[PDB]
Design a protein around this ligand. Structure first.
Ligand SMILES: Nc1ccccc1NC(=O)c1ccc(NCC(=O)NCc2ccc(S(N)(=O)=O)cc2)cc1
Ligand SMILES: [Zn+2]
Length: 258
C-alpha cells in the first residue's frame, strides 16, 4: 500500500508515511502574482545546456524521467537566486486527465495542463543523494505547459512513450536537447520549498518561469496513455500525477521581473 495519486494513497494520505508533508516549506504553492515582490538584486538565470548528455527515459510508476549524465559539469543551472553550480540530473512532467488541470504550481489559482520539472543538484554536495539532505541541495526549474500549438522539441519525448508504457520500463534516449523545451523568456518567480513527491524533502530552491510553453492536444493525449501500473497488472492511466498547492506559511515569493 505505497503512495500514489489514487483515493486511498493520494496526496491527503502522504503525511502518514512522510510527516514532513505538513512542514514549513512544502511545495507546490500558489503564486499570487500581486503579492510576489520584485527583487532587483536577483540575477538573470544562466541555463547552460549546450553539452547536455541525455541517456535514458524511465517510467517509474508516478511519471517518466529523462535522465542525464551528471558525472561532470555538462548541463548546469547557475545565477538567479542560486549560489554555485547545479547539475541537471533528470526532467519529468506532471499532468492532468483534462486540459484544465495538471500543474503543481498555480498562478493566481490558475492551473495549467502540465508542468515540466528540470531537476538539478548543487555540486558542493557531491551527489544527488547527499544534496536532497540539504536545505540548498536542489534547484528545480519549473515550466508551465498550456494546450495550443505543438512544441516541436517535445515530439521526440512523445514518440518514445509507447516503449515505456508501464512501471519499470526504460528505453535508451540519447542526444535529446532540453533547450527545445524552454520558452523565450527566463523571467521567473523563486521561493524555498520541497520535493513535490515523497519523500517531500525540504531541499529545493524553486525557480518557476512566468512564460508557459505551448504543446498540442495530441502531445498531451500521448502523456495520458501512459500507465501507473506494471505490465500484466490492471491498466490504470497515468493522469493527475500532481500534488495540489500547499500552505505558503512563513515564505515570500520573489519575482525576477516588474
Ligand atoms: N542519484 C543518487 C546519487 C547518490 C545517492 C543516491 C541517489 N539517489 C537516487 O538515485 C534516487 C533518489 C530518489 C529517488 N526517488 C525519490 C526522490 O527523492 N525523488 C527525487 C525527486 C522527487 C521529486 C522531484 S520534484 N517533483 O521536481 O519536486 C524531483 C526529484 C530515486 C532514486
Ligand atoms: Zn516534479
Amino acid at each position: 500500500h505505497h503512495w500514489g495519486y489514487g483515493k486511498h494513497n493520494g496526496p491527503e494520505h502522504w503525511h502518514k508515511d512522510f510527516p514532513i508533508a505538513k512542514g514549513e516549506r512544502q511545495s507546490p504553492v500558489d503564486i499570487d502574482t500581486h503579492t510576489a515582490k520584485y527583487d532587483p538584486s536577483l540575477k538573470p538565470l544562466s541555463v547552460s545546456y549546450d553539452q547536455a548528455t541525455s541517456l535514458r527515459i524511465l517510467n517509474n510508476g508516478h511519471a517518466f524521467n529523462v535522465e542525464f549524465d551528471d558525472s561532470q559539469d555538462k548541463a548546469v543551472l547557475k545565477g538567479g537566486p542560486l549560489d554555485g553550480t547545479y547539475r541537471l540530473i533528470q526532467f519529468h512532467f506532471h499532468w492532468g486527465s483534462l486540459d484544465g488541470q495538471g500543474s503543481e504550481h498555480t498562478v493566481d489559482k490558475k492551473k495549467y495542463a502540465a508542468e515540466l520539472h528540470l531537476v538539478h543538484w548543487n555540486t558542493k554536495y557531491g551527489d544527488f543523494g547527499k544534496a536532497v539532505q540539504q536545505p540548498d541541495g536542489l534547484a528545480v526549474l519549473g515550466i508551465f505547459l498550456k494546450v495550443g500549438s505543438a512544441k516541436p522539441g517535445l515530439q521526440k519525448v512523445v514518440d518514445v512513450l509507447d516503449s515505456i508504457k508501464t512501471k519499470g520500463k526504460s528505453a535508451d534516449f540519447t542526444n535529446f536537447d532540453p533547450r527545445g523545451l524552454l520558452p523565450e523568456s527566463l523571467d521567473y518567480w523563486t521561493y524555498p520549498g520541497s520535493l513535490t513527491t515523497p519523500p517531500l524533502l525540504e531541499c529545493v530552491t524553486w525557480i518557476v518561469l512566468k512564460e508557459p510553453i505551448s504543446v498540442s492536444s495530441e502531445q498531451v493525449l500521448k502523456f495520458r496513455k501512459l500507465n501507473f501500473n506494471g505490465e500484466g497488472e490492471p491498466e490504470e492511466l497515468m493522469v493527475d500525477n500532481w500534488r495540489p498547492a500547499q500552505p505558503l506559511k512563513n515564505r515570500q515569493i520573489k519575482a525576477s521581473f516588474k
